[PDB]
């Protein structure tokens, strides 16, 4: 009977809430009161990459922390040498409605996808030396909102069809499927060990999945509206989410509940992108108010503002060595900040 | 470094060419329910000149238009609609005869209101195709329409003086079609401010003037944008 299942689900949800409340005798502020505030974080723009024609939806740094791929709604994946500003590649995309892009950890491949429901993998190390279409991954029934390489041969993607998918690139087959979200999955982030990954969806909930088994390990609630961005803490035992309710929230996997909230009365716009610095002490969050805010992740108070973008900040990215932060925006320019 | 700069300038010339191609094409978002006749409009536009989006290329007076029929996407549009804020226009197709979904016309009204008041689509113009005139006329003439029950405001609605009925059109048909258009314009004129405009049209699924209507509306949109640049509007 469906009524009995509903009653059992309500009882289980109440039990989960009580268990979470039992382990919540100490707040993050009381624990972190021993740590002094970082003060104002005055970043400055060092490089401004120009050449994208439309609003930029995604960028992704390289492991070398000098090369970065960027995806614009004009149908271009531009691969930038951030040090010298020189464009290293400019891949014309078959579909100009690209909403995400990834750069392979080995650096030999890039990925893109969007409203066409297809993940396109391009080779950066061809025999001829030019960029060509190397793999097409189809099987998602909703717009591809995020994609992340695990290695040269495996990729993890999230779609607007409420599902995530792990693909083997060599054969193009869906190695694993992840279901359970009731809203469009807007972002995902691989753990540092690449065995787990958290995804945020348009249902005010985040889900931590084990890649190997394909089952949803954990579910985190607390947001009020659609979750747009998500990212693991550098240690891999926590993560942060940005939502349309104009609040960021840091959750802990082992505590199975919220650790901290980042919001202000003046802020009435949703967060489109979040990223942790190398240390994990600062949380950079792009906003719809055309700005990017640096939050003291431990003290929850604002530490800085990255003003300078003339439109919606759609994507952030921190170098693997923590040297620079690249922010794309709907004004079609990437800005590097130190 | 010399080779890197050589590759960079080789990329820059191609990007200049891509800019020339990109600025010369007008992107259009075709949106609306499948029963509204949007697919018939797409088919007519294509014959005139699994996938998560369908691209249609056509040209009017050597001007290239690129329409995007968002197919194979879920009904929750609040996220993938944001990709179409920079398009020239959103062609919103309404099943004008689908009153009495219990009321598809009210669903279209709510969707148009959401599009109009969306913060990212607040600068995007809407071309409104009330695309069921041929069925609306038959419904109202036969007496089975009875719009008054689903719309009490139709009990006292008077046709505006400036309204121009089609030749040989029954007054009730004109009254009903302009009532629906007036509901859409009541939505649109509320907090319009001149940043984005609504272009209501009385269309049919097999009309051959839809391409010309979209072309003229896009020309008007571009002219109004240019006049807003000079602060003349």
């Amino acid at each position, epitope marked *: 009977e469906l009524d009995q299942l*509903r009653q059992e689900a309500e009882q289980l*949800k109440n039990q989960i809430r009580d268990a979470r409340k039992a382990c919540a005798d100490a707040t993050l502020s009381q624990i972190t009161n021993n740590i002094d505030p970082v003060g104002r974080i005055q970043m400055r723009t060092r490089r401004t990459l120009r050449g994208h024609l439309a609003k930029i939806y995604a960028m992704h740094w390289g492991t070398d922390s000098r090369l970065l791929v960027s995806a614009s709604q004009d149908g271009k994946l531009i691969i930038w040498d951030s040090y010298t500003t020189n464009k290293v590649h400019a891949i014309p995309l078959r579909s100009s409605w690209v909403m995400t892009c990834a750069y392979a950890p080995s650096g030999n491949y890039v990925a893109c996808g969007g409203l066409d429901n297809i993940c396109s993998i391009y080779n950066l190390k061809t025999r001829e030396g030019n960029v060509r279409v190397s793999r097409e991954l189809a099987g998602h029934t909703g717009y591809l909102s995020c994609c992340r390489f695990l290695d040269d041969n495996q990729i993890v993607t999230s779609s607007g069809d*409420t599902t995530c998918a792990l693909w083997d690139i060599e054969t193009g087959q869906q190695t694993t499927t992840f279901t359970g979200h*009731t*809203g469009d999955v807007m972002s995902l982030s691989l753990a540092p060990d690449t065995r787990l990954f958290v995804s945020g969806a*348009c*249902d*005010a*909930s985040a889900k931590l999945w084990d890649v190997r088994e394909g089952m949803c390990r954990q579910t985190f*609630t*607390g947001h*009020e*509206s*659609d979750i747009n961005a998500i990212c693991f803490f550098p240690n891999g035992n926590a993560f942060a989410t940005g939502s*349309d*309710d*104009a609040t960021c929230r840091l959750f802990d996997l082992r505590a199975d509940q919220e650790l901290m909230t980042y919001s202000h009365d003046n802020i*009435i716009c*949703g967060i489109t992108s979040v990223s942790f610095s190398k240390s994990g002490r600062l949380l950079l969050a792009g906003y719809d108010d055309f700005n990017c805010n640096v939050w003291d992740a431990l003290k929850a108070d604002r530490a800085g503002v990255l003003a300078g973008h003339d439109n919606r900040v759609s994507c952030l990215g921190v170098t693997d060595d923590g040297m620079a932060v690249a922010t794309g925006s709907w004004d079609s320019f990437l800005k590097i900040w130190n | 470094e010399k080779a890197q700069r050589e590759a960079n300038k080789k990329i820059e010339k191609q990007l200049q060419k891509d800019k020339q191609v990109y600025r010369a094409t007008h992107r259009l978002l075709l949106l609306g329910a499948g029963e509204s006749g949007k697919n018939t409009i797409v088919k007519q536009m294509r014959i005139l000149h699994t996938s998560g989006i369908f691209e249609t290329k056509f040209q009017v007076d050597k001007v290239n238009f690129h329409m995007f029929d968002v197919g194979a996407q*879920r*009904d*929750e*549009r*609040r996220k993938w*609609i944001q990709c179409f804020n920079d398009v020239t226009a959103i062609i919103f197709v309404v099943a004008s005869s689908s009153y009495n*979904q*219990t*009321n598809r016309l*009210q*669903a279209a009204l*709510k969707l148009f*209101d*959401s*599009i109009w*008041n*969306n*913060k990212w689509l607040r600068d995007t113009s809407v071309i409104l195709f009330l695309n069921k005139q041929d069925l609306l006329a038959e419904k109202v003439l036969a007496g089975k329409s009875k719009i008054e*029950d*689903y*719309f*009490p*405001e139709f009990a006292r609605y008077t046709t505006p003086e400036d309204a121009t009925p089609e030749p040989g059109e029954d007054p009730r048909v004109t009254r009903a079609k302009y009532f629906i258009r007036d509901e859409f314009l009541r939505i649109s004129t509320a*907090s319009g401010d001149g940043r984005h405009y609504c272009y209501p049209h009385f269309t049919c699924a097999v009309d051959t003037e839809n391409i010309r209507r979209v072309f003229n509306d896009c020309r008007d949109i571009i002219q109004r944008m240019h006049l807003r640049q000079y602060e003349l509007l």
Partner: nanobody, 126 residues
Framework: QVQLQESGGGLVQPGGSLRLSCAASGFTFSNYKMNWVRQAPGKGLEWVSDISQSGASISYTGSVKGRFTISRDNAKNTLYLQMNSLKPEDTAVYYC?????????????????????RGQGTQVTV
């Protein structure tokens, strides 16, 4: 967790009166515009009414204008639909819906098939 629980529905004689109540929790009720949407048997989701954040702006579907009255108690974080002069066409499951973004005039996707911030609904049999 966004929780929307509806109650007050039940059997009623045609032309009778009724009152639907919606208890909202997990979100700031006053920051969100609220909706009543019903799903009649054999039919999709139908939008009945909506009320703004403060309650100053109100709209109804035409079929219920002058018959039902929507209201919200922001202090009590609840929503009300006072139903008067009911008709046999009103027999439906009523969902108290919330549209996702706060402080926004757009109220997208409240009538979607698999919408998230929507209640379980209460049955109203006229």
């Amino acid at each position: 967790q966004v929780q929307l629980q509806e109650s007050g529905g039940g059997l009623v004689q045609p032309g009778g009166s009724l009152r639907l109540s919606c208890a909202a929790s997990g979100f700031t009720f006053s920051n969100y515009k609220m909706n009543w949407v019903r799903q009649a048997p054999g039919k999709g989701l139908e939008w009945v009414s909506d009320i703004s954040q403060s309650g100053a702006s109100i709209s109804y579907t035409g079929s219920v204008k002058g018959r039902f009255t929507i209201s919200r108690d922001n202090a009590k974080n609840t929503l009300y639909l006072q139903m008067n002069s009911l008709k046999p066409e009103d027999t439906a499951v009523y969902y108290c819906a919330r549209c996702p973004a706060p402080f926004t005039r757009d109220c997208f996707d409240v009538t979607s098939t698999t919408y998230a911030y929507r209640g379980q609904g209460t049955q109203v049999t006229v």
